[PDB]
Ligand binder design. Sequence first.
Ligand SMILES: [Zn+2]
Ligand SMILES: [Zn+2]
Lengths: 42, 116, 102, 49, 148, 46, 147, 41
Amino acid sequence: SFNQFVDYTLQDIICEDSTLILEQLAQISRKYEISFGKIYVT
Amino acid sequence: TTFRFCRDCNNMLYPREDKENNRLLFECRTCSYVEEAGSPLVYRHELITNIGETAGVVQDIGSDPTLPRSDRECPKCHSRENVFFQSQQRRKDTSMVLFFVCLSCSHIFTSDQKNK
Amino acid sequence: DLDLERSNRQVWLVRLPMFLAEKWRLGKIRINKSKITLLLNEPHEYDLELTKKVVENEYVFTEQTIPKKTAIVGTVCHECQVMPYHKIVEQRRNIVKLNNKE
Amino acid sequence: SLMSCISVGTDPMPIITFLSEWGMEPLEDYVPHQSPDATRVFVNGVWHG
Amino acid sequence: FIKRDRMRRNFLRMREYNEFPLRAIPKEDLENMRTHLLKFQSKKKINPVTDFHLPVRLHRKRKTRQLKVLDENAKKLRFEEFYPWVMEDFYNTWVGSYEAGNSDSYVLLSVEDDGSFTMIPADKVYKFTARNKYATLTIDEAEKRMDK
Amino acid sequence: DNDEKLIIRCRVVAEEDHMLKKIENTMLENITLRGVENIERVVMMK
Amino acid sequence: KGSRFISTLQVKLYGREGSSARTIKATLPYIKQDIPIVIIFRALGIIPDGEILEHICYDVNDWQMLEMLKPCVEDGFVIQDRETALDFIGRRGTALGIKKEKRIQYAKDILQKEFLPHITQLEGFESRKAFFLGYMINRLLLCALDR
Amino acid sequence: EGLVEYIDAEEEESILIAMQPEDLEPAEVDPAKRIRVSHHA
Ligand SMILES: [Zn+2]
Ligand SMILES: [Zn+2]
């Protein structure tokens, strides 16, 4: 139940909301996103 | 019980007494559709149950793993292999009598003797 | 302003397994009287099975409040699904049950 | 007990996939009145069909 | 009535027909064109829109920055297409909703003028239902009545 | 009592059928036929 | 996966035994009150009564279930339209988005995600839930029927 | 190789298990031995 965890759940938790975006309006508008990658463990 | 449904509305055909003909109809309370009363009964309560006690009976009934066994004949086939179980009415006060099923013709037959 | 092109174009919608539909994103129907078959275009030979003889209240329409350019193609004539050559189809099917991920 | 372990579970996708290709008619098309004795097929509490 | 182990000493020692061709339909017409599948719940035997009624009219019926939630395009597109499709006369009426259960693996065999056919993928299906046929509605008229 | 089918019926002098349903309920429910309320299984014992 | 929901549809059985008013309501989240069940079949597009009993009583032959079903049906007879039904619910939970054009969207919106978060959370599968629910009812009767 | 099958609670409702194989599987004594049930099943 730990080998299961470290391998898969950790990543699937990342992949759910890698992304979140911020859009700045101008006077043409901006839009800032940031997204995550696959997870690396030492 | 045993009540029809509308046509072109397919909704439950409620009793509507005809006073003129001195009789009961059956309508679609959604639309116009109505129809006469074919059985002078209306309703019933039927407190008691001896219905369904053969539930799960299938021509695939033997294939069950864990109904134990015996040898009685088919009261029709005279076929003496069959399987048993108890009253499907898993009600409280039900009696024990055992429902048997031919494995030649699936002939139902119980084990009580007081009334067949 | 809905338009009715035919509403009677007899059509046979089919459901498919994944591979051929994916390969479909021609052939030749060898009806046999009713062991209907189809000679695909090269590839395998998949017959016709009659998923539903008679098909009703179901028709084909098109698109181009806000209405849009919508036409009535035709009625579903008869529903079919597919019998998928066979062992390889059977092999890949069981093989398909063997996916993986990183 | 000594001889017990715990399902650490998996994806159910390949399973569903199988039954799809194996006669488990989709639910939506279920018409009971005419198909009285269909065996319901559940997965993880999801009555698929 | 004992415990014996060295049986590794033992175990290591004891060891007619009618053809009908097909054709994947040209793609440009598909590219310009959207087609989908009609389904009715009338329980009417065929319900041919031919014998339904005329006419037919089927149709759908600076500051600072901020956070936007994220959705895939097809969902936004289809969510955006929430206006239910409606065919009318000006008399009976039909509307449906999307089903999302069986739009994937679906190609149609257009019985062309020839015995041959073409294969056409399925974009959408819909389930138009008759409505207002006996035309009773009490939007809040039975609602406030309900509390009785 | 001589009848094998112990059957009893009644009629009254909208739809009467529903009061009957209310009516037949109370009949079954709240009409004791004898014996005091709240008391059941008069169990002998020596 | 997805916010690990704790959403508990409950399907209460009003009515002590024998008594009439054997009605059945269900307690969908974010909804102020318990909603009669037929209002929900309708809410998922099954208007007609005959279609309804298909979803719940899996036999044209047992009628007893139908009998305990009887009162629960007229419970719905008030409503006959999905949108009225859906509007009804719109009138029933956390009324902030006054726009009925946005509110009945919302009772739709909720019943997309916020109800049986399993078998789906997306448009279109509305009927499939209407079975699963329509099944849960069956057992509730079936149990209370002592079978 | 399909020799032994992992089994859980829910699954057990559906099956009919045997205590000891030699005890039971073949269809067919000390006073000091505990008395043991039959292989009718
Ligand atoms: Zn009607
Ligand atoms: Zn027999």
